[PDB]
């Protein structure tokens, strides 16, 4: 009855690079768990090499039980060092006749809690590194509208030691809230260093907050991969939706960017370790209904290079082509998809 | 071999009336998660109105590894305004050969954290709605035994700041205390304004706490659709009972309220939105075991009126009988039993 | 496909004794959650009466991708009260190249929230007991190499309030964390007492921190029976090991000891009630592939004792040697393994 198919493609460039094509599919007859439906979702991500400086936008569109919802937000980031990074940016959103904009900068830190060559020496793929993530906001957002005057009278109310303990449940709503800990991560009460309305009036925030996590939420444990800001030399991107209802969900993602494979040691390569917060927060819906898997993941390699392990192992070879499908590797799709981290390794070299 | 058989209907009462009858049967030959079994438990709710007061009474009977347990409670309720409720009663316990009786007054004000308007005028059935909801108690125990006297004089040893803290885990026994979180809920720490010896003696205790939610809640996202007493034109109750052992779990639930149904807009009415928390926190003890399911819902309209719209799809009509069973339903059956909340509405008309 | 096979067998001595020797084997073909992998470990700990003291062993060898690490303690334990405890002991660890011993002394009080014989008198077999445990700790470890005066530098410059709280997250690296509260458990902040380097140089530090549980946490609510020093009369042991990979895990234990079986009041005796948190936090790994149970017990009794009671019950008998399979003791077997907490009950009597 319940299958989920699902196809997944990866082609990598090959040399210096650790650019991939990524495409997945999948689809499943069984309700998604979103408490209005149907939804749909649409998304899509570019970056651009500005000159190190990256131009990040992203653009959400969405419909939650028939409302039509918006995203809109684009962001110059850089590096300042290996552990402060800065944004600036703007973007807008809208929920039905609704709408507004913003504008914001920022700094964020991150901060591993106790780095040793000890460890440094001994692991060889190391995975949960915990540590703590400090943002610095400032953000201002016209407030050319009845609600948005309304909402920031609101605020001013409210901002005494409750509010920025409180407003945790309003910042992660629904089951945004009990995923944190899930995911071994915790968010500080917010601090208010100010707050006032600019020349129409702008509302201007200044704010902060941090984040931590015991080594699963890969924001903080893999600060530097994740922005792979030295090997943009041309423009990434990456587009997904999906369809979802009370009978069933589809997915499609395509996107090629680097990061896909990294270094991995002696001369070989890995596809990068999964991160661990997807599969970690999808497991809360994963288990809801009993499915077969049916299921087939392709990896193409660069000309001339060979998987050199494979972890559940691959079902078959041909020249730079190599499947998986069955067997073990269907056990460990179904694994993940309930919120299972166990590792699928692949490594190769030329 | 796991088949979970169930049975629900609902037959509704037409016109204005929110009011329906619920019938619900299960079986299943799991064993249920109790580390004490058999486990059997009968309840049974009742409310009138007495004049816009309500009379609420419950009265819960447990036998749990053999040991008897009474709960009996009758309640004087009535809001004052839309957040505020005010509630006086009595009551009392029994455990084996002990018991002891108490009586209270309370209030209970529930805070929406950040109505706008814009999200009303938007959004056409709303689900999360965060807030806090804080509780002020007043409470008497007569200190008519030496278990109470011993009680009494203990907690007035422990009553520093750790004891509004600490007593979180004394509250929330056993896996109760996991289960907040997985709502998304929190407890505050707790505050005792005064304790004291009344002429017997009486213990009276004066002191409140506060609960909040992100939106999964119900009890604070749904606060005055969870109390209809503009509907409460005649006596309302429910009635419930299961038995549970180390090899299945039967239930049956039976009851006649108001609020089964409710003004969609625009001439429609839907069963009400699924609650939640009961969702979400038998979502805990759904997936120990896996299953198949054989269940059948029957919905049985008001003469006259049709139902526009049903995701799941009925699978069978004749004249105002309605009849869901296999297929996406049994899907979503299976779904909602292990802690899914996908949503499945019903819209009808006349 | 997915078949979990494993067998258990529990041989029980008599008389007064509350021994028992124990043995458990799993075969189960399915990916280990471990984000490393494979993952093999072998652990065992001895236990003598030395004089009421204890001496306890541990020796923890395991092996994450590839890497070794080992880790021995020897610990002499003894209780001072019913809820006062101490330990002194030494020991050390290893991580491939790496390695760093330490010694220590420590003091472990065990208190209840609110003892009461009121529930004393009237429940045969609780369960769930409030909380709450401090430790109090002093340890020094040499600081006889470069990593280890590097981590006790850094740890001085961390050592403000914020150091105590989150060390917690440092603590419980990776899922460690989120298991706290799937246990109703909770961590204190740390404090820090002392910490100095004595004369090489030795980092001596004196810290404490308290956990407490609603009852599931089997360390505060079974503290006295976990630690059956009385019936040490001649040592105990336990060894076990796994191996796991992308394709299975098997595992096999086996061992020696007292406690297995219990005074069940009136003759009776009882195989322990199950402990909880070993369930609770498997739970979190076991639901990742759906599998077909191939298990058996086998329990033997003393000469002469029969079953008085087992539910689920047993499949069949001879003499003193009575045996589960299948049926609802299959139901049960994959329910615990999931995370279920339903009670299994055995008990016998001559
Ligand atoms: C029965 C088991 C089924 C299954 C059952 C379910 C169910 C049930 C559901 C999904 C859902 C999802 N499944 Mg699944 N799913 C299965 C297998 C799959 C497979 C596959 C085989 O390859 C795929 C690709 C998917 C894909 C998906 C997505 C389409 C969707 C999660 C959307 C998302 O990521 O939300 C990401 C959302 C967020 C990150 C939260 C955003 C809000 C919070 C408040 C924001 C805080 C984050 C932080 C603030 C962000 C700020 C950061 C910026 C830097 C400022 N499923 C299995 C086989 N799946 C869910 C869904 O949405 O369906 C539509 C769901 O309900
Ligand atoms: C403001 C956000 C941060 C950032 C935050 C993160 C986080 C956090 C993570 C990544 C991860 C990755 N990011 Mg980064 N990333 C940023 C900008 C970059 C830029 C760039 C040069 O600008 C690039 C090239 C990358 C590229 C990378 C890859 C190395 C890696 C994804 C690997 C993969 O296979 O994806 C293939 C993609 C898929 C199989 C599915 C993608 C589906 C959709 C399209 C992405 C939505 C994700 C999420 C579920 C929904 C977002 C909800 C928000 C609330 C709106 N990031 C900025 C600086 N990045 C991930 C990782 O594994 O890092 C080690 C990860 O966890
Ligand atoms: C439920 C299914 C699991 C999942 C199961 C699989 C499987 C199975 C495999 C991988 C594999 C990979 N996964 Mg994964 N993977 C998940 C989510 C992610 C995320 C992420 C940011 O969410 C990242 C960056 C990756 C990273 C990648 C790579 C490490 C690896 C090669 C890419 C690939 O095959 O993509 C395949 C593409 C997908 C799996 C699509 C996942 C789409 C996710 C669910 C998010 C969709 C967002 C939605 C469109 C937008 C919502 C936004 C709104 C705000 C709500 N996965 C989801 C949670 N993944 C392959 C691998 O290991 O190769 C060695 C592989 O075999
Ligand atoms: C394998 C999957 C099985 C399954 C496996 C399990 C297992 C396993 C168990 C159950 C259990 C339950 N299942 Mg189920 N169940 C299935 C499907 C069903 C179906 C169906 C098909 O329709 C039904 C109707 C049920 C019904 C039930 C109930 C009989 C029971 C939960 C009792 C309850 O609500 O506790 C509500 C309890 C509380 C609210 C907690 C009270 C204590 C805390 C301390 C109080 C704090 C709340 C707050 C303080 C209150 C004060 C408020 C006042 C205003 C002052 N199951 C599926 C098919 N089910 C559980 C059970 O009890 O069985 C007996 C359980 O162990
Ligand atoms: C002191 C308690 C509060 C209160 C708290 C809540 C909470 C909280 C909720 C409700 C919900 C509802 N309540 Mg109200 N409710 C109160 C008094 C009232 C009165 C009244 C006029 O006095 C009435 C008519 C109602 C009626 C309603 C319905 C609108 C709705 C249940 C719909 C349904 O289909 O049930 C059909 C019933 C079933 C299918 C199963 C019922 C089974 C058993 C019999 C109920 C026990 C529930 C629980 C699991 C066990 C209780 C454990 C306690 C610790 C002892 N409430 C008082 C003021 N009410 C629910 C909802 O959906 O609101 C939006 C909900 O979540
Ligand atoms: C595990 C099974 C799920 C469940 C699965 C279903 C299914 C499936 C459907 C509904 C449907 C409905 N559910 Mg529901 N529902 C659950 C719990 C509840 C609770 C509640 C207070 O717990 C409420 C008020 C409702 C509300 C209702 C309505 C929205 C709707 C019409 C009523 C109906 O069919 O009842 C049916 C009656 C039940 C499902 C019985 C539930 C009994 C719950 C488990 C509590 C029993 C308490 C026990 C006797 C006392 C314990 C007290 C001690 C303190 C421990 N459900 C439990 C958690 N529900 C129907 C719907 O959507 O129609 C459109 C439908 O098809
Ligand atoms: C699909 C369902 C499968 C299944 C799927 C899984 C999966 C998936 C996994 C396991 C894993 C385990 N399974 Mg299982 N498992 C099944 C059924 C079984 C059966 C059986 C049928 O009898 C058995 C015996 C096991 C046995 C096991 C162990 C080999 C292993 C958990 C190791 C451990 O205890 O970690 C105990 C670990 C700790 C206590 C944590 C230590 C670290 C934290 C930081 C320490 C804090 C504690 C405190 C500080 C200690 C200090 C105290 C001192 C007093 C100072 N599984 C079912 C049938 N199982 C997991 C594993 O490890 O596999 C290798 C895992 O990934
Ligand atoms: C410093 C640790 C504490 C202590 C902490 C605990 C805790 C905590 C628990 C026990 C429990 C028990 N302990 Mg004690 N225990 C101590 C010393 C003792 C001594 C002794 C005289 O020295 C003895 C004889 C016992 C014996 C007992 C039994 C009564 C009972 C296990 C019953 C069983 O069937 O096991 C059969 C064993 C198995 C079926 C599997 C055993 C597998 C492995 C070999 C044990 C590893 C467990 C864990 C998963 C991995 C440890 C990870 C650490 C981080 C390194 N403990 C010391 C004082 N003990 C348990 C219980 O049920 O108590 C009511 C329990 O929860
Ligand atoms: C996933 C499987 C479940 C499990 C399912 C079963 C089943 C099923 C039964 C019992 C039964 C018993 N279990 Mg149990 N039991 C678990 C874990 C434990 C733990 C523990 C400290 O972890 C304790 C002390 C016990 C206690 C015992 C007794 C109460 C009872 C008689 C012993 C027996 O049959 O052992 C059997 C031995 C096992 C089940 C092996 C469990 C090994 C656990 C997983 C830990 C392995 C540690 C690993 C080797 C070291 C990791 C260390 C590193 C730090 C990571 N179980 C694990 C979590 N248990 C029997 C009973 O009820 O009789 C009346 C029975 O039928």
């Given at each position: 009855?319940?299958?989920?198919?699902?196809?997944?493609?990866?082609?990598?460039?090959?040399?210096?690079?650790?650019?991939?094509?990524?495409?997945?599919?999948?689809?499943?007859?069984?309700?998604?768990?979103?408490?209005?439906?149907?939804?749909?979702?649409?998304?899509?991500?570019?970056?651009?090499?500005?000159?190190?400086?990256?131009?990040?936008?992203?653009?959400?569109?969405?419909?939650?039980?028939?409302?039509?919802?918006?995203?809109?937000?684009?962001?110059?980031?850089?590096?300042?060092?290996?552990?402060?990074?800065?944004?600036?940016?703007?973007?807008?959103?809208?929920?039905?006749?609704?709408?507004?904009?913003?504008?914001?900068?920022?700094?964020?830190?991150?901060?591993?809690?106790?780095?040793?060559?000890?460890?440094?020496?001994?692991?060889?793929?190391?995975?949960?590194?915990?540590?703590?993530?400090?943002?610095?906001?400032?953000?201002?957002?016209?407030?050319?509208?009845?609600?948005?005057?309304?909402?920031?009278?609101?605020?001013?109310?409210?901002?005494?030691?409750?509010?920025?303990?409180?407003?945790?449940?309003?910042?992660?709503?629904?089951?945004?809230?009990?995923?944190?800990?899930?995911?071994?991560?915790?968010?500080?009460?917010?601090?208010?260093?100010?707050?006032?309305?600019?020349?129409?009036?702008?509302?201007?925030?200044?704010?902060?907050?941090?984040?931590?996590?015991?080594?699963?939420?890969?924001?903080?444990?893999?600060?530097?991969?994740?922005?792979?800001?030295?090997?943009?030399?041309?423009?990434?991107?990456?587009?997904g939706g999906f369809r979802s209802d009370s009978q069933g969900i589809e997915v499609k993602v395509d996107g090629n960017l680097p990061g896909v494979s990294r270094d991995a040691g002696?001369?070989?390569?890995?596809?990068?370790?999964?991160?661990?917060?997807?599969?970690?927060?999808?497991?809360?819906?994963?288990?809801?209904?009993?499915?077969?898997?049916?299921?087939?993941?392709?990896?193409?390699?660069?000309?001339?290079?060979?998987?050199?392990?494979?972890?559940?192992?691959?079902?078959?070879?041909?020249?730079?082509?190599?499947?998986?499908?069955?067997?073990?590797?269907?056990?460990?799709?179904?694994?993940?998809?309930?919120?299972?981290?166990?590792?699928?390794?692949?490594?190769?070299?030329?």
């Amino acid at each position: 009855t319940t299958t989920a198919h699902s196809d997944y493609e990866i082609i990598l460039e090959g040399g210096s690079s650790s650019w991939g094509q990524v495409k997945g599919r999948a689809k499943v007859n069984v309700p998604a768990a979103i408490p209005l439906l149907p939804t749909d979702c649409n998304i899509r991500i570019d970056a651009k090499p500005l000159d190190g400086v990256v131009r990040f936008t992203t653009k959400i569109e969405s419909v939650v039980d028939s409302v039509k919802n918006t995203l809109n937000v684009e962001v110059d980031i850089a590096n300042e060092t290996k552990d402060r990074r800065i944004a600036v940016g703007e973007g807008s959103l809208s929920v039905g006749d609704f709408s507004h904009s913003f504008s914001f900068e920022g700094s964020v830190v991150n901060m591993y809690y106790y780095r040793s060559d000890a460890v440094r020496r001994n692991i060889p793929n190391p995975i949960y590194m915990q540590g703590r993530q400090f943002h610095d906001i400032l953000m201002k957002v016209p407030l050319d509208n009845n609600d948005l005057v309304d909402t920031w009278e609101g605020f001013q109310q409210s901002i005494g030691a409750n509010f920025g303990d409180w407003i945790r449940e309003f910042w992660f709503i629904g089951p945004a809230f009990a995923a944190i800990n899930e995911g071994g991560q915790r968010i500080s009460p917010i601090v208010v260093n100010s707050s006032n309305v600019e020349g129409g009036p702008v509302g201007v925030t200044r704010w902060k907050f941090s984040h931590a996590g015991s080594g699963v939420v890969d924001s903080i444990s893999r600060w530097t991969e994740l922005f792979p800001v030295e090997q943009l030399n041309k423009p990434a991107s990456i587009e997904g939706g999906f369809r979802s209802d009370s009978q069933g969900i589809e997915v499609k993602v395509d996107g090629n960017l680097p990061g896909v494979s990294r270094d991995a040691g002696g001369g070989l390569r890995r596809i990068l370790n999964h991160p661990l917060i997807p599969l970690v927060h999808h497991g809360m819906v994963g288990k809801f209904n009993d499915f077969t898997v049916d299921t087939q993941l392709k990896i193409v390699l660069p000309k001339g290079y060979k998987i050199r392990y494979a972890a559940p192992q691959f079902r078959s070879q041909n020249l730079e082509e190599y499947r998986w499908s069955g067997g073990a590797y269907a056990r460990w799709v179904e694994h993940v998809c309930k919120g299972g981290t166990g590792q699928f390794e692949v490594l190769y070299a030329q």
